[PDB]
Design a protein around this ligand. Structure first.
Ligand SMILES: CCOC(=O)[C@@H](C)c1cccc(C(=O)c2ccccc2)c1
Ligand SMILES: CCOC(=O)[C@@H](C)c1cccc(C(=O)c2ccccc2)c1
Ligand SMILES: CCOC(=O)[C@@H](C)c1cccc(C(=O)c2ccccc2)c1
Lengths: 387, 387, 387
């Protein structure tokens, strides 16, 4: 039975998601694919050809992969202190939950940024000692502010632990994008275009819409908390269009970020995921060598009893590598997977995975902010069960 | 020599405080007293007779003393669960710095409120997992909100540790004032009037100015942070009149709190401090029996090597009793004192102490919010050096 | 692209290294090789044919390999107490950072020497409880002193931990060379010649220059700290010829050491590295059996959270075996590698590796003391990326 269709259709029929697309490839070619629902429930327009999604933190594996290419090319290395490229990050301080502030005892490195061990936090982090000051500064909300300028504001705030000593999912991929710009003298969006998107023919992926993109953009549903104040409990899961404020412009030619902000399509993201099986384009051009791809995918952050968590949500059986999650214990996993399955996901419920043991990739595209329902993992589980 | 005058005149002559009054009594009679500076630097009006000060958390020993009287009279007991008097405090939750929320595993008691071990926080607590939600609710800022209603809003928010398991200086004295009202059916300001202020002849003490009070109210100086966002470093110490917003009304007949909000005078507060040497009025009427006064003053919360801290500011060598600080190790103390010295202080730099070994009481009144200079401790040390 | 050339040329063009040679072999034959820069910037003489390098601690894997040959031949064993061969090492003492001295509670063994777990330190060790006494004794500086005589002076000084209980990179390979002499009745340089260099046709490797060697010796650049006092921060990385004092003679026929002092060439060192893939010469003569080579290469010292460090510089993902470093966690590694990659390096920035998973060896020869730039690891990473 087509478990993937059953999951997606049940989600649409229960009024939980407006529209869903999915594709699963094996050996670089589609084996399962489908769509359910509509572009938007207001007009019930069908999902268009080459529909466009805000992929939020599925931007991070792309920007991280770019960083690995630059490491391979000698621009910087994992151990490089970021203050060597932007001195505004010299002399960081660390704050704790008891109001105590002290100088950081270790320099932030490229590796710390890629592993979320740098001590940064995030505006929406509930209970965080510093996230109120991120929100006051509007680091995420003010999407119109140039990346270079956002970093200057961020650099003045304290970290929430000494670099290297803990893990916390964070704005550090945005720092990484900025440090890439400092190190190369180029803009991160131009680098992504030349080094990744153009070689993989990802012609619909970028920080602004294509000229014909407005009619292809999927509507985004959900509730963003008033003033950005982190919610103490989930809002009701209701299909109401979300207000993104100025956080996610569609046609700002200077908007670029490391941790979110890309628009993409199912087809484009599958080209990226399939490349991660080998480090090569389908024509055989190498984007990253096998040795550095192995360095990027090896489990690098290991977690204690409570496991990997983001705002206390678990990622059971997962460790962290330089690009995102990686399954390191199927016996601890909460849904079907295989050892070494890796990938990431975004807050509008987009999700992808790469499963080297099956030469398999998969991606689910939808637009629902802060879903109470783990559609991405449900679709991965369905696809795993259908092999 | 008169070190007390020297300290006070130096502070005034360095443009650090506008006006200061102090008195030190021994055996219930004044032994040192003085005044320095002016009511306000704008007009340089002289400090009036019976000048009036916002005493902020010097409200807490008074409200705590009232609670001990009510315990003595059988209204409730230290072990009483506060949910027995207001069921809005049933089913509390606890939040941590990792965004994890769970049910409280102990009920909040009267003793927890008096010792700041209930798990409540404070709006201005820097780095606190929940203070951002206090600020969003304007618990402290909205002084026009009735105490009973402010408590309903607070009760819906999580604690930051399980009741009884830690110490954190907090809004719990306001909860105590509210629970007093629940338990007695009377208002806390009326109970304070009948049980404490009138027997001690504290005719100028209350939550609103006396009829002839506006001309005697000292000006308040200092910088309250924008939006109440807790500052990451001290603001420059400058004598600029402070803007209190709607947090501290002068003529609201329903304004009443437990942790702040009283107006008082040097002479009134000394009457209260002298009473704490015996539990008796000067006429010999008992406000609190010797046994319950001993219960209230005995060291009750003991601190680790980090010591007692508020927003990471230390109270070196102090433990906590049911009314405030108490000196338990002169060899750890950071300024002159004796074993058993007790008292408290307020954010506008008012300060008092009681020293049973010398039958001594002292009080410094001034108005500077968030002083970088610990005038209260400096004046205590001067008085200790003189006796 | 030729990443190796790009790295080397960038280092020369940025005035960071005078001259660099490299070679990478696979299956015993060169696959990548090159050179950049000059022998010396003063005259800009090109790097000569068979250029000679001071290889410093790349002496250690050679002397360690010699020790394994002697273990195989029954001269001594890993568990042999060194005091059995030189009684000046009976009755060692241990000093700590609190000035406390006590007798060592374990005897130093051959294995302790090969693993730097014997408790010795090094003259240049910053912050070390005993390195000031090494410097006073001029153990490293006085290169004219006979090895046998240096050992007598060293033997009178305390260790910095009990043998076997910790790891600290040390003068212990020099102790090993001396104990080899005691055990065999032969000089270490004669043993190296007969057992290793002559079988591998390493005709330019030794503790003094060949008769035609003076014109082939690469100039050495960098700053040695005045009086040998360990620096608190890196000196500026500037190409100024280094003053080696009497630490590294070119034509002393009795100069021999275990931890440094060899002159070699790229070609000679690659013959040694290639032999470590098999324990055999290219003609198939066995220098060390497969079983004892496996014993020598197996990870033997494992490190805690802070990892393997020398003067606080990290070797991320590396453990220690009887010959040097060995990669035991690619997920912790700071630059491209494979599980089981091993080798060592020297303070003038020479570096080599052996990668059994690729049947690969590599060596970078240059002369810069105390480089701020990890040229050896950069070149390894480049070569790994080019496979
Ligand atoms: C996957 C990428 O998520 C992010 O990193 C940032 C960019 C982000 C940006 C804008 C809006 C949100 C939320 O709507 C939200 C966050 C937390 C809880 C509920 C909703 C999150
Ligand atoms: C001593 C009693 O002050 C308190 O602890 C609480 C009751 C309180 C209540 C109302 C206003 C403020 C401030 O204005 C303020 C707090 C922190 C920094 C600067 C200003 C504080
Ligand atoms: C790899 C072999 O390093 C050694 O074991 C010893 C022989 C050594 C001998 C002579 C000079 C130096 C330094 O120049 C130096 C040491 C520490 C920091 C900066 C410079 C080191």
């Amino acid at each position: 039975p087509d478990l993937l269709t059953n999951v997606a259709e049940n989600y649409v029929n229960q009024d939980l998601f407006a529209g869903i697309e999915w594709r699963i490839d094996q050996d670089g070619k589609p084996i399962f694919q489908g769509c359910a629902g509509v572009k938007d429930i207001e007009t019930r327009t069908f999902i268009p050809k080459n529909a466009i999604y805000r992929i939020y933190s599925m931007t991070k594996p792309i920007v991280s992969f770019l960083a690995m290419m630059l490491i391979e090319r000698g621009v910087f290395r994992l151990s490089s202190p970021i203050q060597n490229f932007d001195p505004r990050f010299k002399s960081m301080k660390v704050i704790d939950q008891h109001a105590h502030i002290e100088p950081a005892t270790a320099l932030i490195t490229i590796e710390h940024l890629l592993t979320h061990q740098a001590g940064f936090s995030y505006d929406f982090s509930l209970g965080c000692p510093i996230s109120a000051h991120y929100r006051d500064a509007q680091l995420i909300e003010d999407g119109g502010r140039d990346l270079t300028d956002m970093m200057g504001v961020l650099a003045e705030l304290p970290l929430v632990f000494h670099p290297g000593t803990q893990w916390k999912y964070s704005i550090s991929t945005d720092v990484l994008a900025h440090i890439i710009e400092c190190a190369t003298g180029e803009r991160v969006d131009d680098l992504l275009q030349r080094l990744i998107f153009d070689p993989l023919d990802m012609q619909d992926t970028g920080f602004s819409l294509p000229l014909d993109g407005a009619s292809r953009l999927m509507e985004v549903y959900g509730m963003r908390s008033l003033h950005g104040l982190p919610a103490l409990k989930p809002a009701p899961h209701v299909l109401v269009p979300a207000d993104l404020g100025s956080s996610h412009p569609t046609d700002d030619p200077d908007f670029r970020r490391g941790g979110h902000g890309l628009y993409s399509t199912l087809d484009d993201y599958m080209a990226f995921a399939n490349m991660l099986l080998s480090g090569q384009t389908p024509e055989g051009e190498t984007l990253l060598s096998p040795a550095v791809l192995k360095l990027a995918l090896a489990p690098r952050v290991h977690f204690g009893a409570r496991g990997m968590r983001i705002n206390d949500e678990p990622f059971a059986g997962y460790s962290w590598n330089l690009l995102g999650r990686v399954m390191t214990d199927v016996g601890a996993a909460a849904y079907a997977t295989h050892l070494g399955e890796f990938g990431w996901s975004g807050v509008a419920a987009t999700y992808f995975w790469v499963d080297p043991t099956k030469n398999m990739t998969g991606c689910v595209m939808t637009q629902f902010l802060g879903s109470q329902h783990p559609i991405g993992s449900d679709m991965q589980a369905a696809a795993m069960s259908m092999l």
